[PDB]
Amino acid sequence: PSNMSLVKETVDRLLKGYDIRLRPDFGGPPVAVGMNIDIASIDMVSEVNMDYTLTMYFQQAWRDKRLSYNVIPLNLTLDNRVADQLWVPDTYFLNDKKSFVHGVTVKNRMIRLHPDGTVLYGLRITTTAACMMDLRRYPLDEQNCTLEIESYGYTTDDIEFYWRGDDNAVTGVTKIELPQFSIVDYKLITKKVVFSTGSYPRLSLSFKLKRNIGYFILQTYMPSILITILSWVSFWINYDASAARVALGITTVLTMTTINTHLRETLPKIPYVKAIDMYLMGCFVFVFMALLEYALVNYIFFGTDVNAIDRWSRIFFPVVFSFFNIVYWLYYV
Amino acid sequence: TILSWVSFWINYDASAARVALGITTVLTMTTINTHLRETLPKIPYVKAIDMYLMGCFVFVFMALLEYALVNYIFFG
Amino acid sequence: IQTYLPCIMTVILSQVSFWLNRESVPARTVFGVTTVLTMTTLSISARNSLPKVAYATAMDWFIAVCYAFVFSALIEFATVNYFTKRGYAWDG
Numbered sequence: 001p002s003n004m005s006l007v008k009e010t011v012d013r014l015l016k017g018y019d020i021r022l023r024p025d026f027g028g029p030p031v032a033v034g035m036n037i038d039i040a041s042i043d044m045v046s047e048v049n050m051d052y053t054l055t056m057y058f059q060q061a062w063r064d065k066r067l068s069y070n071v072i073p074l075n076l077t078l079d080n081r082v083a084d085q086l087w088v089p090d091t092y093f094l095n096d097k098k099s100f101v102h103g104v105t106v107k108n109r110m111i112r113l114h115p116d117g118t119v120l121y122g123l124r125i126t127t128t129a130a131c132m133m134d135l136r137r138y139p140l141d142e143q144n145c146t147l148e149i150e151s152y153g154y155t156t157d158d159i160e161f162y163w164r165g166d167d168n169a170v171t172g173v174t175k176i177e178l179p180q181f182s183i184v185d186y187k188l189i190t191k192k193v194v195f196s197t198g199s200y201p202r203l204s205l206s207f208k209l210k211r212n213i214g215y216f217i218l219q220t221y222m223p224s225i226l227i228t229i230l231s232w233v234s235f236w237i238n239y240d241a242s243a244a245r246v247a248l249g250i251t252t253v254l255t256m257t258t259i260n261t262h263l264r265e266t267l268p269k270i271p272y273v274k275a276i277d278m279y280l281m282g283c284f285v286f287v288f289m290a291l292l293e294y295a296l297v298n299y300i301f302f303g304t305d306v307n308a309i310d311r312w313s314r315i316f317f318p319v320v321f322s323f324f325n326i327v328y329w330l331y332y333v
Numbered sequence: 334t335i336l337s338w339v340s341f342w343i344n345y346d347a348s349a350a351r352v353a354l355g356i357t358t359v360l361t362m363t364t365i366n367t368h369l370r371e372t373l374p375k376i377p378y379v380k381a382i383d384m385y386l387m388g389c390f391v392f393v394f395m396a397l398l399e400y401a402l403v404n405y406i407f408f409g
Numbered sequence: 410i411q412t413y414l415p416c417i418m419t420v421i422l423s424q425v426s427f428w429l430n431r432e433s434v435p436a437r438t439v440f441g442v443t444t445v446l447t448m449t450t451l452s453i454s455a456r457n458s459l460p461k462v463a464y465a466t467a468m469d470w471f472i473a474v475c476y477a478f479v480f481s482a483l484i485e486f487a488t489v490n491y492f493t494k495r496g497y498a499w500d501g
């Protein structure tokens with residue numbers, strides 16, 4: 001128990017007369033605050049809220065002469081509550097919408113004082129960071145979502161940020177398994193953002209997510225392709241069968257527009273036209289033209305050659321649809 | 334289920350009519366069942382409402398197969 | 410009773426069209442189109458329960474096979490109608 005008393009005396013000395021209101025090297029050079037992330041998971045990448053939920057082990061390391069000790073050789077890992085008695089950088093995520101440090105069992109914090117004065121301060125943070133997504137090529141789109149770590153109150157004359165370990169500062173991104181996304185790349189940037197109050201350091205952790213297209217084949221593309229192929233069946237029914245061909249046509253057209261509306265209602269009310277919208281409207285053109293082809297057939301007959309029109313449609317509709325698919329997929333993939 | 338039975342008073346030589354009526358009735362039975370079950374949790378057993386909906390589905394499907402049987406006895 | 414039974418019932422519905430006379434073009438056509446549309450909406454609804462996983466689940470394969478069955482039932486009716494040499498059906 002003697003070493004316990006020695007460590008108690010050392011920590012009591014460290015916290016005695018400690019001005020939490022004053023940063024390290026106050027009235028001096030900016031304190032270098034290194035950072036390193038451990039991405040626990042990326043979840044809830046939702047375009048309706050234009051955000052993504054990021055769970056991470058956010059570590060910051062900074063020198064502090066006031067927290068330097070030399071009697072004890074080992075590194076003191078203190079109870080997390082001591083973080084309330086220590087100066088910590090006032091970092092924030094500029095695009096954060098709703099964040100929290102995890103609660104159970106205790107506050108998910110780590111404080112580790114090293115003999116040289118280095119403070120390793122870690123948090124387990126779940127942050128719903130805002131990511132404004134460009135859905136013009138959705139679902140065949142790459143989204144560049146960022147986390148903007150910045151010092152709120154301290155300018156570059158009072159604090160500096162750097163990725164501790166350079167490109168090795170952020171880890172665990174590869175092990176992330178998003179349901180409908182693939183994280184093809186991630187990048188770390190150090191900037192100096194200027195506001196009217198001064199110039200502040202900035203760390204930008206940017207993930208370039210790539211959306212997986214397999215699910216959208218199952219739910220979005222294949223049903224509409226099948227409905228178009230079904231609408232092509234009306235060309236194989238003789239022109240006299242008005243009820244059958246008209247029912248086939250209107251059922252296909254209405255189901256197409258219903259599919260488009262149902263899919264677009266889930267997504268946000270973005271004004272521009274997406275890639276899925278482009279494909280759905282293109283196939284709506286095909287099915288509506290099938291219905292209008294029967295309309296032309298009926299008018300031309302009632303109001304040999306009509307069999308010619310029906311036969312030419314019977315082969316040109318799949319060919320033109322296949323060329324539409326060629327152009328669309330070549331442009332977007 | 335009541336309007337499924339009006340197919341029986343329709344003329345036998347009205348396939349486009351009776352078939353459409355029975356199809357609409359059975360598909361609506363399926364839609365009602367799914368809409369009711371969506372509100373409830375993913376409960377893995379049949380409830381009383383479930384068993385009544387299933388019985389009425391069996392009845393409307395039987396009416397549709399009654400027209401099928403009449404058509405196959407007359408034509409086929 | 411939410412996906413598998415509806416899919417089996419719509420497949421058996423599409424297989425009712427085979428017992429209707431070939432001349433009833435509107436009836437078998439509405440049979441096929443309604444079964445196909447029901448299969449489409451069932452496929453769309455089934456995916457809504459689980460996440461947007463890229464791969465296909467066993468439910469997806471069962472739905473795909475049922476979709477192939479109903480689509481082929483309509484294609485079969487179209488083939489029958491192609492060789493339907495007369496419009497008027499049996500009488501007397």
Ligand SMILES: *[C@@H]1O[C@H](CO)[C@@H](O[C@@H]2O[C@H](CO)[C@@H](O[C@@H]3O[C@H](CO[C@H]4O[C@H](CO)[C@@H](O)[C@H](O)[C@@H]4O)[C@@H](O)[C@H](O[C@H]4O[C@H](CO)[C@@H](O)[C@H](O)[C@@H]4O)[C@@H]3O)[C@H](O)[C@H]2NC(C)=O)[C@H](O)[C@H]1NC(C)=O
Binds near residue numbers: 073074075114
């Ligand atoms: C209390 O805490 C301190 C600080 O962490 C510990 O001291 C450090 O222990 C680490 C062990 O991980 C040492 O790191 C190793 O240093 C080797 C020499 O590097 C020199 O040069 C670098 C240049 O930046 C200096 O930062 C460093 O201090 C040294 O002067 C490297 O060769 C090692 O590289 C690799 O090592 C293994 C594989 O061998 C890998 O697993 C590593 O990830 C790494 O890739 C490694 O970096 C470090 O030298 C120690 N001193 C420091 C940081 O000043 C104490 O041990 C700890 N005391 C306890 C726990 O009782």
Ligand SMILES: *[C@@H]1O[C@H](CO)[C@@H](O[C@@H]2O[C@H](CO)[C@@H](O[C@@H]3O[C@H](CO[C@H]4O[C@H](CO)[C@@H](O)[C@H](O)[C@@H]4O)[C@@H](O)[C@H](O[C@H]4O[C@H](CO)[C@@H](O)[C@H](O)[C@@H]4O)[C@@H]3O)[C@H](O)[C@H]2NC(C)=O)[C@H](O)[C@H]1NC(C)=O
Binds near residue numbers: 083084085
């Ligand atoms: C936003 O985020 C900030 C983070 O900085 C939060 O601010 C901290 O909030 C916590 C919780 O409210 C504060 O913790 C409080 O510390 C007080 C001082 O503790 C010292 O002194 C006492 C004796 O006076 C010692 O016992 C202790 O060990 C320290 O040496 C305590 O007096 C407070 O006690 C209250 O809570 C306890 C919980 O067990 C009760 O039992 C008590 O009866 C009493 O109600 C409390 O522990 C902390 O000081 C705040 N600042 C910092 C820098 O951490 C904000 O709360 C959060 N939200 C908002 C809206 O700002």
Ligand SMILES: *[C@@H]1O[C@H](CO)[C@@H](O[C@@H]2O[C@H](CO)[C@@H](O[C@@H]3O[C@H](CO[C@H]4O[C@H](CO)[C@@H](O)[C@H](O)[C@@H]4O)[C@@H](O)[C@H](O[C@H]4O[C@H](CO)[C@@H](O)[C@H](O)[C@@H]4O)[C@@H]3O)[C@H](O)[C@H]2NC(C)=O)[C@H](O)[C@H]1NC(C)=O
Binds near residue numbers: 144145185189204
């Ligand atoms: C997600 O999207 C964000 C957009 O916000 C991207 O972040 C930007 O990335 C770009 C490119 O990485 C940054 O732009 C510049 O990067 C340079 C990298 O070095 C190259 O260029 C220099 C100069 O041409 C070459 O000498 C060198 O060999 C490399 O080829 C930096 O060097 C740049 O900094 C310099 O220019 C600026 C502006 O002139 C000066 O202020 C600096 O002092 C310095 O002289 C510059 O940073 C850009 O900074 C990033 N942030 C933005 C735009 O806010 C992400 O990369 C992207 N991520 C993914 C995964 O897609």
Ligand SMILES: CCCCCCCC/C=C/CCCCCCCC(=O)O[C@@H](COC(=O)CCCCCCCCCCCCCCC)COP(=O)([O-])OCC[N+](C)(C)C
Binds near residue numbers: 229314
């Ligand atoms: C360039 C490459 C582009 C690539 C795309 C390829 C596009 C090309 C595809 C074009 C469509 C193929 C039909 C072309 C011929 C139609 C005309 C015709 O009627 O011909 C004949 C019948 O027609 C047949 O022989 C039927 C063969 C096609 C049936 C395929 C069904 C399979 C469904 C699978 C779907 C499952 C969906 C799976 C999900 C994905 C006979 O015609 P006729 O009546 O006797 O008149 C001629 C006689 N006269 C000359 C005297 C007048």
Ligand SMILES: CC(=O)[C@H]1CC[C@H]2[C@@H]3CC[C@H]4C[C@H](O)CC[C@]4(C)[C@H]3CC[C@]12C
Binds near residue numbers: 292295299
């Ligand atoms: C002669 C002929 O082929 C007929 C066959 C089908 C007809 C179209 C149907 C839809 C109509 C909507 C509005 O009434 C405007 C005219 C409109 C586009 C029509 C133009 C003439 C068509 C093509």
Ligand SMILES: CC(=O)[C@H]1CC[C@H]2[C@@H]3CC[C@H]4C[C@H](O)CC[C@]4(C)[C@H]3CC[C@]12C
Binds near residue numbers: 401424
């Ligand atoms: C002869 C006769 O009465 C006809 C009238 C209607 C027909 C049924 C329709 C549905 C079918 C689904 C599958 O094709 C398996 C067989 C299946 C149950 C058929 C059995 C024979 C029936 C009853």
Ligand SMILES: CCCCCCCCCCCC
Binds near residue numbers: 278281282283285286
């Ligand atoms: C601004 C983009 C408008 C796109 C309109 C739909 C295009 C469909 C083409 C169908 C070709 C047959």
Ligand SMILES: CCCCCCCCCCCC
Binds near residue numbers: 285
């Ligand atoms: C964005 C301005 C309106 C663009 C309209 C394009 C319409 C093309 C439709 C072609 C279908 C035959």
Ligand SMILES: CCCCCCCCCCCC
Binds near residue numbers: 292293308312
């Ligand atoms: C709006 C009318 C659509 C008609 C489409 C006909 C396609 C084939 C044309 C062949 C002409 C001989």
Ligand SMILES: CCCCCCCCCCCC
Binds near residue numbers: 299300303
């Ligand atoms: C798509 C435009 C078709 C124009 C056809 C003109 C028909 C004129 C009436 C005489 C034959 C029906």
Ligand SMILES: CCCCCCCCCCCC
Binds near residue numbers: 322325326329330333
């Ligand atoms: C019969 C051909 C129909 C269109 C085929 C789709 C082509 C997909 C290209 C994907 C990009 C590599």
Ligand SMILES: CCCCCCCCCCCC
Binds near residue numbers: 213225321
């Ligand atoms: C990368 C995804 C490629 C999907 C291509 C689908 C092509 C369907 C063509 C249907 C033509 C009838």
Ligand SMILES: CCCCCCCCCCCC
Binds near residue numbers: 379384387388391392
């Ligand atoms: C497992 C419980 C069975 C659910 C379906 C009940 C159908 C019975 C009623 C049929 C009346 C003809």
Ligand SMILES: CCCCCCCCCCCC
Binds near residue numbers: 476477
């Ligand atoms: C909902 C997605 C269904 C995909 C299955 C495709 C079925 C192809 C039909 C083949 C008929 C011969």
Ligand SMILES: CCCCCCCCCCCC
Binds near residue numbers: 229236318
């Ligand atoms: C291409 C869309 C499906 C068409 C199915 C009809 C096939 C008819 C075959 C009988 C003619 C030989």
Ligand SMILES: CCCCCCCC
Binds near residue numbers: 391
């Ligand atoms: C488990 C009982 C099913 C009853 C089915 C009635 C005839 C289709």
